[PDB]
Design a protein around this motif. Structure first.
Motif, mmCIF file in Angstrom:
data_model
loop_
_atom_site.group_PDB
_atom_site.id
_atom_site.type_symbol
_atom_site.label_atom_id
_atom_site.label_comp_id
_atom_site.label_asym_id
_atom_site.label_seq_id
_atom_site.Cartn_x
_atom_site.Cartn_y
_atom_site.Cartn_z
ATOM 1 N N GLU A 1 7.508 68.233 79.589
ATOM 2 C CA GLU A 1 7.287 68.306 81.028
ATOM 3 C C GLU A 1 7.726 69.660 81.579
ATOM 4 N N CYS A 2 7.519 69.859 82.876
ATOM 5 C CA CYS A 2 7.893 71.110 83.526
ATOM 6 C C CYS A 2 8.180 70.888 85.009
ATOM 7 N N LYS A 3 9.207 71.563 85.513
ATOM 8 C CA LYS A 3 9.587 71.442 86.916
ATOM 9 C C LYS A 3 8.965 72.561 87.747
ATOM 10 N N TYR A 4 8.331 72.187 88.853
ATOM 11 C CA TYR A 4 7.694 73.158 89.733
ATOM 12 C C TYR A 4 8.673 74.258 90.132
ATOM 13 N N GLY A 5 8.403 75.477 89.675
ATOM 14 C CA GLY A 5 9.269 76.596 89.993
ATOM 15 C C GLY A 5 10.290 76.868 88.907
ATOM 16 N N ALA A 6 10.675 75.821 88.184
ATOM 17 C CA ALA A 6 11.651 75.952 87.110
ATOM 18 C C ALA A 6 11.224 77.017 86.105
#
Length: 34
Positions: free
Chosen positions: A8-13
């Motif tokens: 997964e990936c976090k928006y902005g991360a």
């Protein structure tokens, strides 16, 4: 100090591995351009 694109990936991360982009819709790390 990063995680695979398949995960997964976090928006902005920026934790993700440099070179890949984070999809706002899919919410994951990919290589394709937006």
């Amino acid at each position: 100090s990063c995680k695979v694109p398949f995960n997964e990936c976090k928006y902005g991360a920026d934790e993700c591995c440099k070179g890949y982009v984070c999809s706002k819709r899919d919410g994951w790390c990919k290589y394709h351009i937006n």
